[PDB]
């Protein structure tokens, strides 16, 4: 999928997790977010289109999705551990990783 | 290792998982698959040899092994949770990720 | 952070794990190591500064941190499963991955 579609999937599933009742719902949404994060790794964001495809900026962009996927996975572990409120709280904390990349490249 | 050798390790361990008796056999095979997937990330596949090393095609190739590694890890989690036949079925479902990359680059 | 700073974080937390009393101490250190491993993925190491940014050597370098992150995560799983001394021993075994990269690129 294109970058913007993956970002809509990330944003939409944050709100799903926010309103989730149980851990299965949280787990399903985090799974969808992890897939979107890795798929977004394939894209070139408009503000880096003039950069080398392996410039430091593009590497930082791509590695940002590795960091987000690993952080999504930490939240999933908390859900799989039955700790739903903790997984939700962790899913909210993902915004700091969302924001860090946006501040540089959105 | 060679790309071809990593693919043999992926294929061989998919059949090991299919015939496995118990969770330890599944987890050991999935561990070997994850290692092969990440090692295959280092390679340039013959059909992309005339492409730039960070062309969209090479990124898509490399990210495909991130996606496979994460999907392998999901199956390992199910095995770690004792859900053996669920892990085996998940390992069978990896073939859709195997085929998606093959369709494009094999 | 600097590549050098990330390497000191990996080294320091290996000794923290070696002396840890319980699983929360091991988990917290492994989390810091995984973060440093992925951040180190963004760097260009001195020995490869004259290589193209997606040369086979730079890919091998970056994928080495994917492999380390996954091995760190395997050790965390062992901690999260209460197997403290098994996680400590696994953290000690990470040195073979530290050494393999160092031999090529340090
Ligand atoms: C870099 C590593 C990013 C991470 C991590 C996240 N986002 Fe992002 N996002 C990024 C870019 C470069 C862009 C611009 C894309 C474009 O083509 O304009 C975006 C955009 C969004 C959007 C708006 C999409 C649009 O219509 O243009 C949203 C709603 C969004 N991002 C949400 C989002 C969330 C919730 C994230 C973490 C959970 C997140 N993004 C991570 C780069 C990166
Ligand atoms: C891209 C991201 C791939 C993924 C994911 C998987 N495979 Fe693959 N495979 C890929 C290529 C480009 C090639 C051709 C390599 C060559 O040098 O010809 C292959 C090849 C195979 C083979 C045959 C190996 C050979 O002797 O040439 C097998 C048996 C194979 N692949 C199996 C396999 C399985 C089971 C996968 C999922 C678990 C899988 N591959 C993923 C690229 C990619
Ligand atoms: C490549 C994939 C590496 C892996 C995996 C690890 N290290 Fe590393 N390290 C690497 C390079 C190219 C360098 C030299 C660059 C530099 O930072 O100087 C290093 C360096 C170190 C150092 C010295 C830091 C300094 O002040 O120069 C230490 C103490 C170190 N590395 C530790 C370390 C540990 C414990 C690792 C595994 C857990 C590890 N490194 C992995 C490249 C790579
Ligand atoms: Cl996950
Ligand atoms: Cl936007
Ligand atoms: Cl790259
Ligand atoms: Cl990568
Ligand atoms: Cl795994
Ligand atoms: Cl083939
Ligand atoms: Cl971890
Ligand atoms: Cu895990």
Alpha-carbon gap, residue A79 to A73, rounded angstroms: 10
Which chain A residues are closer than 8 Å to B72 by Cβ? none
Q: Tokens 């989390």 correspond to what residue? A: C31
Alpha-carbon gap, residue A48 to A58, rounded angstroms: 7
**Residue B7 CA: which ligand is closest?**
2
Question: How many Cα neighbours within 13 Å face the side chain of C106?
Answer: 11
Q: Which chains touch C (3 or more CB pairs under 8 A)?
A: A, B
| Element containing residue A40 per DSSP (H, E) | helix A23-40
| Mutate: best of A59, A73, A82, partner C, most C CBs <10 A | A59
Nearest atom (ligand 2) to Cα of B33:
38
* Interval between CA C53 and ligand 8 midpoint (Å): 29
Interface A-B: count of C-beta contacts within 8 A: 33
Residue A65 three-state SS:
helix
Burial A59-90 (b: 16+ CB within 10 A, else e): bbbbbbbbbbbbbbbbbbbbbbeebbeebbeb
Residue of C nearest to A52 (CA): C53
| Element containing residue A36 per DSSP (H, E) | helix A23-40
Interface A-C: count of C-beta contacts within 8 A: 32
Q: Structure resolution in Å? A: 1.8
Q: Tokens 């990124």 correspond to what residue? A: B59
Q: How far is CA B9 from CA B24, B27, B37, B72, C68, in A?
A: 18, 15, 9, 13, 20
Q: How far is CA B39 from CA B23, B35, C63, C67, in A?
A: 24, 6, 8, 8
* Interval between CA A77 and ligand 6 midpoint (Å): 28
Interface of C with B (CB under 8 A): 52-56, 59-60, 63, 66-67, 70, 74, 77, 81
Contact criterion met (CB < 8 Å) for B66 and A42? no
Alpha helices in chain B (DSSP H): 3-19, 23-40, 56-80, 84-93, 95-105
Alpha-carbon gap, residue A81 to B56, rounded angstroms: 38
Is C16 near ligand 3, meaning CB less than 6 Å away? no
């Amino acid at each position: 999928a294109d970058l913007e579609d993956n970002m809509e999937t990330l944003n939409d599933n944050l709100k799903v997790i926010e309103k989730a009742d149980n851990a299965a719902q949280v787990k399903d949404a985090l799974k969808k977010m992890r897939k979107a994060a890795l798929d977004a790794k394939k894209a070139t964001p408009p503000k880096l289109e003039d950069k080398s495809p392996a410039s430091p900026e593009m590497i930082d962009f791509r590695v940002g999705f590795d960091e987000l996927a690993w952080e999504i996975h930490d939240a999933a572990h908390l859900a799989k551990e039955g700790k739903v409120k903790e997984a939700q709280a962790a899913a909210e904390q993902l915004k700091t990783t969302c924001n860090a990349c946006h501040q540089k490249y959105r």
